[model samples]
Target: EYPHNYAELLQKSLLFYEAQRSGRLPENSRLNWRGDSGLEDGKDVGLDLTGGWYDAGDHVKFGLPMAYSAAILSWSVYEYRDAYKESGQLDAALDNIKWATDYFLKAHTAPYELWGQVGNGALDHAWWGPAEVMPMKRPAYKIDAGCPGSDLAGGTAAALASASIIFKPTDSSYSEKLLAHAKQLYDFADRYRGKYSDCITDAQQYYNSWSGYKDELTWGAVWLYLATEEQQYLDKALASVSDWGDPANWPYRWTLSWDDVTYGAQLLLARLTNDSRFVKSVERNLDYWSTGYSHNGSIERITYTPGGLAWLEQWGSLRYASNAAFLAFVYSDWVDTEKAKRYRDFAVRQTEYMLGDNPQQRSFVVGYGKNPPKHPHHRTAHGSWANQMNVPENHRHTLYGALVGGPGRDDSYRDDITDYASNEVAIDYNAAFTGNVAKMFQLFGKGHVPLPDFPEKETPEDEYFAEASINSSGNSYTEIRAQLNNRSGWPAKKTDQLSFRYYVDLTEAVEAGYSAEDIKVTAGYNEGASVSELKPHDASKHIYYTEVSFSGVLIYPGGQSAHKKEVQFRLSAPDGTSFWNPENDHSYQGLSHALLKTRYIPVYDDGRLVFGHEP
Candidate 1:
């Protein structure tokens, strides 16, 4: 395998988290394209659940997975503090975790209540647009005493506890505040006795925790024990280990994931106190990835690609392997022998494999290494104003640092944005990958340098414009076909007052003894469209324009109909009047039967010219 810059890779990974930030952005935020969004997330519910990371490609703030990601990232910080500090990424890492925890602080509003969701899955996924202009009503869903969410409460508690530990040395008071809330949330989870998916049915489609809450409860307790060093917290985790299935007979089942916190709990439990049950449980799992493990009658082993990647599953295959590698690295410290060296080697092998060692020789991460992913299945990066993904052909911005859902079992992969299975990037996908990368950096990478400035790309021009075609014309009347398009992307949003002005030179009408009022207008087909009389533009030279208005139009880059509205109108004088000349009109400069884009006609929003301009 080739050498890799683990420190730079870690830097980019944290930057991806910055792009997924919601609510108001910081003044020095690296992602210039992202703006203040989801600000009024909880106004409808009388609580503030704003300012959390969007879980994945879509803009839904599913709390369970979001919290799971933070917890895993924080675990890395706790294990590899020297890795982060030496690599000069400790501050960025801390800030990213704090961003999530601050929102968690607001979410845990009451002792027994926590807002678990912000946007509806059905509504948020229906449209593909930037979060800044999300038109759907963001309704807040909560878990209270009556509708208990043990998994959510526990997951969030784990995130808070882990965050508190890392932030303690930097901000003591804030760290203490986090620990206090973590305890309260832990209490709520312990007292409550139900699954979050059952409580908030809306989350069932997105981040359902099918593995149940026992794992998270144990996970949360272990993290709290690490933070407080209190025997009671460790004792609490020990008491619940039995409920997590017969720890004595438990085997390596799945990798550490959002729903399955059992593996994390097993590892932490084994490390804290070298009890044989927890020790064997974590050892069995790491052994499966490192040495070998015996199953039923056969010694079944993990499948690996020709390129040495331990292929787990088609969806997030790299995520699972990278997560396992992180655990293996953490486990190596416990043994510190040739046996541990095998586990450490396994960790290094998997981490470098992702950096660029596969058969394709392509990086699974975006914006790093040779042939990295360009079009990840991300909405903001794939900024489409016309409500289509393939319109731009390439993603607008570099989604730097995101680990894409990796290659299939056979080592096949594609960077297509539409392929969510192989191209999607998510919070959970990066959690353990970040941890493993940092661990590798501390060992091999010598540079402890900060990332250079992220450059700002030029913004796209002409968000709104007009497409027109001359339908038909006569001596006195001219019929026109036009479409007002709203392909906005500076921050794709709604425009209420949309209208267009069509200019006409009425010098011939004045020369023939007729006034500007001689022209009358009517629409044949439109969406609540209207037209004003020939308004004066440059009255001294007999130049005038008619206003075609759509009252309170819902024009935005959401759906096909929402992005554009078509109108066919006819401007006429007396039935056989010879004064009006359609050829001399400014709007008729680019006349055609089939529709074409024209700058002669200008579109307006609230009487301000936004698209084209007058002559």
Candidate 2:
């Protein structure tokens, strides 16, 4: 009999969909621990990279690998829809892939072009904070004729095409849109053939295209063949496979990853055409991964643990092995009985290892198994750090169902939050695993898959909160300006007193002959807008600066609750615009208890309060 708790594992695995959502999450999202992020990327740039899953432990949303993840998830759902439906997770599974495809649709806003990435990894890594309060600049990059990325563009094409097949019955219009983008992106990939990382150099350090772009070209063509059933697409796929050079050089290459798609091409071809060459090609790849050899006498490059866990790379060990297992299982479904059993056994063992069947005796997933990891190397999962609360006791919210990077070669594991190598989580990390789980459910009868008790998420109360940002700079005279965001889903009454406090260190201004009367506060509220005259609030006022209090009536001129309005506080001099140079300028909202001593301001009624510097 299968593990009695496999159903529970599957349930937890599905929770990852909520944890990785980047943009506006639907109401049905099970893991809505946080709100929207990276919403301004599209407005900032001409392209939109929002609404997809965050790459890994960090909040950066990478396109190439993300597209790859979406394709695998769609393939899984397509092959095992009945299994997912029996488990009562079919809609959730569909939502997960739709979220990704929707983002892909936005990314490919124009024909022959697609945005491939968002956010700067270096800047993102420098600061560790919540995705809701990202302090770094997020820049977007794209792939086109000017800067080609066959690997990335083609992978996106494959994802969109595969997803189109899944959605054809439910949403034909959406399926057509996805197919259109897939064809356009494929044409772009074929026309301008170059590695994406060549132009976006930073990607090379993370997910470089090592095996060249031919694999993605072949991969995209096969997916298009499945989606459109066009003879031209099929011919293109066959031609690209022929471009793989020699079959003698294959088989030994047992791994398929973000940068590799040869095995996927073979699997797709084997299913579409009963051609023995494609079947042999897939058999060679699977045998090399499963029992360590090919017909051409090539040996396996992968090393496995004594407990049958495959170890390909130390960074994302389980992620790599699990993806390989996913492909192996797909191959098994299409091929002979004996081969199917061998590949199925290999896939089951790998999944078992990920779900805690190894020497570590701990599941690498968060919030799932008995000894699941609590301290994953994810910034948003763990809230900002304060002097009182460090990494040890620093998790802000649970990233339920996320699988960590993986353990060491010896199966030695670390539970520390900073251990990104062994503790970081990613969309790709769980994509193949999610598919593999669905496959296992299909292998075992539906009765064997028991229901699981999902944990209750701490829901936030429907309340009002303010988000603020201030900036000031002048050579001789400086002006401080602030913007307040009313972040309530419902509009607060116009009479609601929305107030905040800010301070200007007049030590330099005082030295420059500026006085308190020169300080003025400007408000954006209309009709009944009012502000109290600036007054000294801190009695012991440090020798260097002065603290002032500013309060105003919150207004909804347009009667909008979710609104961002501006406020300006400056020094007006008789001669001209006087500058206030404050070394320590601070602005805060809410009560003293609501404000944390550290960089982060505490949440009121479980809603995040804004606190940051903009100068």
Candidate 3:
């Protein structure tokens, strides 16, 4: 048995090279193009779904933010050749890198909007054969002036990919195109300067917790920051870290729960700006990667399974990479030849083992499954881990962004098919794997990779952060109208039984009231109304309102209040509903019983409170 070390790595490298020479593995393995939007120069244009199963479109469109992978890959290739003398390996890496660049150019040239999915698969393209019949929502083409959506992310991806090529200056033919794409995204983001709606400002529509636009998930804004270098975007991204990423939520198991991205990006941003906060975020999740791989002997491919959170392929691979990568940056000798040898040996062993057995014959067999039908490659995205129940293996084959969920091992979803599966998208995977590449580069760099102080210094006055715009094409609000069971009940309302009437748009009178108070009461609910009562109570109770009003602030209903300061709100509910009920007292009910009890959501337009649920 060969010991796991550098000697093993050297041996495996020779083996893979020989395999390539002998056709054991296709010589075109690294050839052709698995590149995303930036693979080809001008030929093989349009979305380069070249790598078939590992197509960039699959990763990007399915939900992976394009920038993460593109930036990392481009940089990795550049860094490898620049830092090391592996001309042969560098040339091989270029096949994929160049293909990616071409795809980037093609996508950038087209309409400037980002794609939701890149492949011709059912969940994305919608143009497959009859049996592959599917529906394709046009990728959000315009800059969503308000909150989270594909447009902002697409733009971000373009910026990162383009900028990486620009700063790195690879092929001159595509430099202009890359720069243009980068600037376009920057301009689009700037258009919505200080008022994104979902998390920070609005709380009503399409947002993860709130419905309005401002409160986008952390991964969403982080891409923008990495791409454009805009302080406001960075601020928004940082705010998410502080609010939702507190130590209590350390491995924040919310969206895109991959801890490595969380810790890595935090650390990178911190190092760039010298902000200790980000450093703390990196420090918190050091042990996150240990949970991803099995305790088996041979280091093989990471099971592309989504079990816990979005695109959760074992919570640890990237997390471990971050620790190792960080060590390379923080401590010069941290990733010495010895450590590099170990990791390299692991990488080689895993690759060798994975390539053997003629595994599936397609892409990759996703994650570990019970009696999983053998296939060349299976899209083991966020489906295997992120969602509650099982989902399609390629769930993460679209273009969303970084995934966030639990700290690598939280079992929030083992057997439920929550809607989370349908949303994994491919970009999430691209960013993840590409991030791994970056970690590898850091470790392999001579001595150590420099950890540039984050938030590159700028004049103090110029460092202010603008909020994401609120009123834009994608900006919209939602009114919950309140559910019956969310508020404080009557003197002795049954704990289980509660009910209420729900409405979306308000009447003209209600709208008028909303202007003054920012929130208006359409119709106040009467004290106690049963919602499926145990003892013949009003299970189907409904309330009608003329139009009442009140003044307050709009707030995200969830516990996280990270971006709260960015907007003013007017949250109002009848005295008895849940919104109005204090934590301790439940019986002093006006309407808290029915309307307030149900999660009363607030709505905002651009950074101001526009409407909310009337208790």
Ranking by TM-score: 1, 2, 3
Q: Encode model 2's per-residue lDDT on 1-615: one tens digit a residue.
A: 224454555666767766777876666655545666677776667655678878887777788889988998888888888877887777777777898899898888777778877887787677665565464688887777888899999999999999999988888999999998999999989889999989777788788888888999999999999998889999999888777877656544547677787778788888899787778778776776687654355565468777677887788888888888898888888777688888888888888788788888877778776688888887666654221124327465677778888788888778888777788788888888888888877776467554544556565332233333334445443344433433331111122344444544555556677666665555443233244545564424422222222234333212232233444544334345445544444333221322122232111221223333211
Task: Count backbone clashes in candidate 1.
Answer: 0
Candidate 1 matches the true fold with a TM-score of 0.91
Clashing pairs in 2: 477-579, 478-579, 478-580
Could you say which candidate leads in TM-score? Answer: 1
Question: Scored by CA lDDT, what does every candidate get?
Answer: 0.86, 0.69, 0.30
Work out the TM-score per prediction. 0.91, 0.75, 0.38
Ranking of models by lDDT: 1, 2, 3
Worst 10 residues of 3 by lDDT: 485-494
lDDT of 1 by residue, 64-114 (tens): 999999999999999999999889899999999999999999999989999
Model 2: residue 49 alpha-carbon error in angstroms = 3.8
User: Which residue pairs overlap in candidate 1's backbone?
Assistant: none
Candidate 2 residue-wise lDDT at 585:
46
